[PDB]
From a paper:
Supported by biochemical studies and comprehensive 2D nuclear magnetic resonance, our data explain how the ribofuranosyltransferase CriT, the phosphatase CrpP, the ribitol-phosphate transferase CroT and a polymer-binding domain function as a unique multi-enzyme assembly.
The crystal structure of Bcs3 (residues 1–1,115, called Bcs3-CMP hereafter) in complex with CMP was solved by molecular replacement methods using an Alphafold19 model at a maximum resolution of 2.9 Å. Region 5, the amino acids C-terminally attached to the SH3b domain, was not visible in the structure (residues 1,116–1,215). The close inspection of the electron density maps revealed a CMP molecule and glycerol located in one of the CroT protomers. A structural comparison of the CroT protomer complexed with CMP and the apo CroT protomer reveals an important interdomain movement that has been proposed for other members of the GT-B superfamily during substrate binding and catalysis. PRTases contain a deep pocket for PRPP binding. A structural comparison of the CroT-CMP complex with the TagFH444N-CDP-glycerol complex (PDB code 3L7K14) revealed that the CMP moieties of both structures superimpose well.
Author numbering:
A (entry chain B): 650 to 964, 968 to 1040
B (entry chain A): 1041 to 1115
C (entry chain A): 0 to 649
Write the structure that this text describes.
Amino acid sequence: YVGASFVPYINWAIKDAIKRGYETIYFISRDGHFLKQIADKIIEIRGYNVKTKYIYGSRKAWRLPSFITKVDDETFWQFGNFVGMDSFEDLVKASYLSESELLSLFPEFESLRHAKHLRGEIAENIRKIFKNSPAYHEKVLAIAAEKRKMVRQYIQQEINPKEKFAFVEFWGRGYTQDTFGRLLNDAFGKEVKNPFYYVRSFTDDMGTSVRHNFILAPQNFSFFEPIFAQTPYDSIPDYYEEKGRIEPIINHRDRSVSDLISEGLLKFTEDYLALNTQDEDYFDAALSQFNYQYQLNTPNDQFICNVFSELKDNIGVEKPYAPALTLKQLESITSKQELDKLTQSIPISLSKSDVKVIDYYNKIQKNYNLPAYNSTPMRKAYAVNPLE
Amino acid sequence: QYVWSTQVPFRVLSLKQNSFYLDVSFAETTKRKDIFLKELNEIDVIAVDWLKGGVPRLLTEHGYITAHKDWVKKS
Amino acid sequence: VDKTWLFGSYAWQGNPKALFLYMLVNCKETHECWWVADNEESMKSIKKSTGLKNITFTDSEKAKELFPHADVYVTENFRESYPVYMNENIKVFNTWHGVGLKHIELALGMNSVLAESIVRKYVRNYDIYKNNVLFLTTSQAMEDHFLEDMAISKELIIRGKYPRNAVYGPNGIHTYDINTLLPKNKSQYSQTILFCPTYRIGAIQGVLNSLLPDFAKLEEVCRHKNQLFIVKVHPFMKKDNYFAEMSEKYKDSEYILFWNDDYDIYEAFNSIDLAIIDYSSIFYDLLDAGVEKFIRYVPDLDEYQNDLELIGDYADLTEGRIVKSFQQLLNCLDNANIKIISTKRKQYLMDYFFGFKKENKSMESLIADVDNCQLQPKSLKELHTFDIFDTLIRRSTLRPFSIFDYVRDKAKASGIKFPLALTENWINVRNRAEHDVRDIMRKTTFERQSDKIEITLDDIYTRLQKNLLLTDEQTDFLKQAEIEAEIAHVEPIQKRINYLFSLKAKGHDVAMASDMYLPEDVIYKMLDRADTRLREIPLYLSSTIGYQKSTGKLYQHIFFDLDYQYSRWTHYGDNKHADGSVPRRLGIQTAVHDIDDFIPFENAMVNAMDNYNRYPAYQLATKMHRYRTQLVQENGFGNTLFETKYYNYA
Ligand SMILES: [Zn+2]
């Protein structure tokens, strides 16, 4: 499953980069661990002429410093920093300011302690008042210019600008790439073309950001985030300096899951570059089309149920992605919000739950306004019984 | 059992109280409830629109009416 | 009795209610007056609270008796629906719900949150609005403002006073005794204050919390001064839980009274000694009722005036001591003798807003101006919009994807080398790229600062070229092949085209509203190849405008772009949603027919072919469809004859 999902894509991307004349391919943190392993194996076997490097970063470590001369209006949009707030701590964190440093700017905000949920039109008004404060803008700009020193130095030390390079991600809107391109321009002091390889992205090329997309269809690949969250270290929070050199803060995790995942991925890369294909690009496109359409519309599959949906994902503690549901857990819900807290995929979770749980969900969904369950329980296909 | 003509427009008499529908489907949600074709009234039919299954509907300036011979009658 | 007047509104309120009571008293001999509520419970409530017997409800047999031969229908709004049996020549006396300096009705435009409701109202009832509405104006300024913002006949204007501001005077009408609602009699307070906040844009705390954070200290002050503080908020402000909290807290408070909205506050205007107002039109009402002490509690002045675009200056056309802080509001309530509005200032405002009051106006004068009015209506044209694809024209291979097949078949044969994924899979490749561009548009409304989300052929092929690394030769070949194929597969739906032109010849206005990515010139070439006359008909193409029928935005754009003067809007189409549900939500009559489609044998034939044989299979299936269509709905054969012929053929 994971090979079909990742290896064909990286084969397409490597060949497309060799075609476009790229000398170096950079793989960005977390999502680029497994993908760079795959790409290295492909380049070893096929003997391609292209270098691969690994770059540590993230949205959190790159958004704030990217505010060179202005704070992005996206920060105050439906997908900005004030989206997902549940408590006052969330608001102060999304504000980039300290609690007291915040309440100094907005004494009106002192009434926001213990908010239960900081979502909706309340968050709309919060985003507006944040957008309306020039003092907030300049303070955020100062904090950003200070945090940008280490990021600029990291870029200058890790990325060779005189080459013809590209970056390889998997899925996203493209805004992270835009902030990173601003950081690139600030670090090298010129209009630096940064092309990103995605499986898909929604936004068009903007400014120096170029976007090479594998699949041209309205599919959402956030689905595969659980897998990349098995990478053996947390999302990079920021940087630090020692030996006069910049380094990413790396708080490690257990390596078992990622170890087995890499084992499988490299086995698949070997066995996939060994296939007698008449046209390899077309088999890339075909195995990718089939595999994505299958994994995105088969919630009762044996292995998407027993392995994938069981992967721990903080999204924030190490809880499964879409576990089975118990009757009392459903007795404890009254909205779709409470159920999203329990699972990230109602169809998969229900396909894993007992028949009585499914029937209770059906009984309560029409009233509580939950999504309609239009699948059947999962039936194992191989190793159908306990082997012990 | 269907009353219709290839030559439009043409007058029809409403044998029974006929309802107006804004969609050949005659779905409940598309049935007008503000006005109807009164019994024994006449009305011009300005088009004949056919379902995918081969059933005609008689369009009037107020919406569709049935073509079933028990409900409409060519004048 | 000779004349008959009905009075209607969504609630027991307003100039309708005032004039209804005033007529049931002072006009019992010349007019028969009834009040039509919206449902039964409203009538029951009115009758229990007032004891009157001339109250009926909508669609009641009494209402079905009265409306067909009534003389006047009094309202405070441009109603959303009017009785279908309402008499042809009735006079709709629209006594508006207030005066002010904010834009309303048609002036709100397509960006307004209320766009759909306005479009629905007007599309439905424009004939009534224009030929039967006598709109009440109170001053030349207000008359000009309203005529600018609405579609009312300048000849049917009614000049006079607001019945709700001049009927419940000291010796006037009262449906309830005020003392029965107050903790103490009005005389046992030093002053009665009425707090009338409007609903604001948005704030973290509820409007009432931002304006009155500490009700305890407010009660302390009002007790010190023996003042009766009556809280009257906009209905939308009551949804806040803070409103309910502070209302239940001070349920038995002797100096803080949360006004019960079951009682018309206007009846109590004469008992209000002070009015704490902000941006509500009610201020003017108060000014017209005789209230002379005003406090403008406008702490958020720069968040409302700077935001909304008004017709005049707020501070100039309003009155009251300015106050922008709760502490200063309390300081004023404790140690301040608010002075009456200066005579010259009251003259200024009263002229500007209720000037026609100085023309010796009266209630009976208003009733006379109404009764003696003459309706000189004009017959209005109708509007008939038409979907294009599968409504006015069709494809010689029926299904849209046939085109792509054709295009693919040309690519592989042109000699220009293409990627295998592109040729063999052209159908999925191109359709999924189209949907991809559509999702991109939908998700990039912020980045583009625009709500338009329609795509263009160029966008689809740009996506394909930039992400499949295709040469200009390949991309242009494919795009021009698709365009030429769409043009060459055009066929007319002759009956609907001829019906459209018969409509046009009857004097009606006709147009085309189509959701399509093709450029406008390609659409016009296709139409011309279907029927040359079609080239002369107006066209609302989504690709050109950016709005679609599926979202209903293209219909709103048509409504606001044309000088809408139509008595009826009819849209002919094939889409149960884009050309049915959505336009109906906008008050548009829809005629939704069925799209052409195959039946089991034809469908199975087409689905059984690979790339080499799918297009001729489309041709043969579409010929079978045309044959059974001709047999059933052209030749008029019976079931058995048609079935025999179709079998023997196919
Ligand atoms: Zn159509």
